[PDB]
Amino acid sequence: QLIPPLINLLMSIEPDVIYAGHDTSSSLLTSLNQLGERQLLSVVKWSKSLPGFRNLHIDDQITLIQYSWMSLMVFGLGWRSYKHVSGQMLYFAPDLILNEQRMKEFYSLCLTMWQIPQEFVKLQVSQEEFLCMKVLLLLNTIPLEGLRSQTQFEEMRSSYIRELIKAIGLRKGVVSSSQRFYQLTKLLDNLHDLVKQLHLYCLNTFIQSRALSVEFPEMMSEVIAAQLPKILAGMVKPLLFHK
Numbered sequence: 001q002l003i004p005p006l007i008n009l010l011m012s013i014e015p016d017v018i019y020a021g022h023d024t025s026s027s028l029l030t031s032l033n034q035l036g037e038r039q040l041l042s043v044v045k046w047s048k049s050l051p052g053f054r055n056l057h058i059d060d061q062i063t064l065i066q067y068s069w070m071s072l073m074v075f076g077l078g079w080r081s082y083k084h085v086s087g088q089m090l091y092f093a094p095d096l097i098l099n100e101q102r103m104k105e106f107y108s109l110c111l112t113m114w115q116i117p118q119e120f121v122k123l124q125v126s127q128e129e130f131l132c133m134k135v136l137l138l139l140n141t142i143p144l145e146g147l148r149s150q151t152q153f154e155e156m157r158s159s160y161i162r163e164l165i166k167a168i169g170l171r172k173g174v175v176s177s178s179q180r181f182y183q184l185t186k187l188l189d190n191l192h193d194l195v196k197q198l199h200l201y202c203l204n205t206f207i208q209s210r211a212l213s214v215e216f217p218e219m220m221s222e223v224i225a226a227q228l229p230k231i232l233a234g235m236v237k238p239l240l241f242h243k
């Protein structure tokens with residue numbers, strides 16, 4: 001068993017393929033919102049089997065899923081684009097793949113999201129590294145006052161940091177593996193800035209949804225309404241690997 005047990009578990013609990021259910025701006029945005037609803041459901045289900053997560057206070061579980069909703073979607077988009085289209089298209093779902101031609105306005109945000117699959121291609125991120133990084137992304141922001149289950153949270157983060165180091169070790173050399181840890185963790189740090197612009201665009205679109213004729217499903221609407229205003233206002237503590 002060359003592949004470490006926890007990485008193998010993460011492989012098995014990965015979501016199955018998620019379809020958007022999918023051509024104008026409002027219809028494209030509505031289809032992306034419909035995908036976002038299904039992605040949110042899949043993340044909550046995933047979190048139920050994620051080792052360590054269910055042992056956190058339920059308030060912290062909800063908070064962490066809501067905080068990391070956008071980040072986990074765009075990180076998953078990065079993987080699928082990388083895997084299916086060599087990072088040269090945005091593979092939101094099998095029934096929703098976007099190239100330049102299908103971006104007209106929104107295009108600017110698509111270009112910034114596009115930076116992630118490009119870094120995956122550049123770094124040649126392995127599935128084992130991706131799966132550990134994904135868990136760290138879920139645990140990458142906390143409230144200003146911390147979590148109720150802070151001690152449990154810290155231990156879990158450390159466990160998946162240690163697992164990421166194992167993941168890197170699968171493919172030699174103390175200097176190189178140390179350099180690769182910096183690169184992958186700096187990628188995660190850099191996502192905070194990218195997701196800020198995605199959060200802002202989302203909240204703006206949510207506010208103007210009636211005028212734009214864009215439907216926002218109920219579960220993802222609650223995340224947007226409940227959390228994005230205070231996240232954008234800076235009422236959370238982003239965690240960073242590098243100061």
Ligand SMILES: Cc1ccccc1CN(c1ccc(C#N)c(Cl)c1)[C@H]1CCN(S(C)(=O)=O)C1
Pocket residue numbers: 029030032033035036039073074075076077092106109110198199201202203205206214
């Ligand atoms: C913020 C943004 C920008 C471009 C394309 C998509 C998004 C975000 N979305 C999104 C949906 C699914 C996935 C996946 N997988 C991703 Cl990464 C983003 C959804 C959720 C909110 N919007 S919006 C602009 O109407 O508020 C569409």
